[PDB]
Design an enzyme around this catalytic site. Structure first.
Site: not given
Length: 244
Positions: A50, A53, A97, A190, A230
């Site tokens: 992601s 993006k 996401s 991820w 994260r």
């Protein structure tokens, strides 16, 4: 005040305690600093997942495949998460996401334009293959943690080869936290369709005084692991270094 040895030990423990292997590259000015419990990951390639993006959004907006206010309607088909079964803008899809929205955007852009734009901005190994809607999820596109902070560095300073407005539009979509006058702009990632799984959190902190400090957290994700580690590891590291 605090020694470099101590900062390195503390950051390393953040990854050790999460029981994973990872690195966090910080960039101050032109200097890269590597922290974590698996420093060798700094120059290894991984799917961007992601985090792509951000570039997907830049490309679609520049080439007029969408606007920042356009509502992408949910088609009514079951999606991996209930939060995705709704109509949303590029910006809401970025925060959530929502892959479906960005797969649609990639399809609008088309394989040919996408490959040409990824080549132009020089993202990672710049290879997207033949599947325009999943190259950033299962390959062949790969990028290193060092390339990610540099990409984050370019975006934070509007240095990518896109109009100034396009970059500003996308940057506004990445605000995930505000801490003591500091703003954290970042995109998490991820990749679950790869083995081992990879986790990301790339972006930068904008300090009150206006200074921008880019970073890139990269670690291995394991089944039964919360995605928020994260963020928790990134914040504790940024704080331990006095960045935020």
């Amino acid at each position: 005040h605090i020694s470099s040895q101590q900062h390195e030990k503390a950051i390393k423990s953040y990854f050790d305690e999460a029981q994973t292997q990872g690195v966090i590259i910080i960039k101050e000015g032109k200097n890269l600093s590597t922290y974590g419990n698996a420093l060798a990951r700094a120059n290894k390639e991984y799917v961007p997942a992601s985090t792509f993006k951000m570039l997907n959004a830049l490309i679609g907006l520049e080439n007029h495949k969408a606007t920042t206010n356009e509502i992408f309607k949910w088609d009514g088909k079951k999606r991996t998460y209930p939060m995705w079964e709704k109509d949303m803008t590029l910006g809401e899809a970025m925060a959530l996401s929502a892959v479906p929205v960005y797969q649609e955007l990639a399809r609008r852009t088309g394989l040919e334009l996408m490959q040409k734009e990824v080549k132009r901005v020089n993202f990672g190994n710049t290879n997207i293959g033949t599947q325009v809607d999943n190259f950033w999820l299962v390959g062949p596109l790969k990028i290193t943690p060092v390339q990610e902070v540099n990409f984050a560095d370019d975006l934070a300073h509007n240095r990518l080869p896109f109009k100034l407005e396009t970059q500003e539009e996308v940057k506004k979509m990445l605000l995930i936290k505000e801490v003591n006058g500091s703003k954290i702009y970042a995109k998490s990632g991820w990749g679950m369709g790869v083995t081992p799984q990879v986790g990301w959190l790339t972006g930068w902190v904008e300090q009150a005084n206006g200074k921008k400090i880019p970073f890139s957290l990269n670690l291995e994700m394991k089944e039964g692991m919360s995605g928020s580690i994260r963020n928790e590891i990134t914040y504790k590291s940024l704080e331990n270094l006095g960045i935020i």
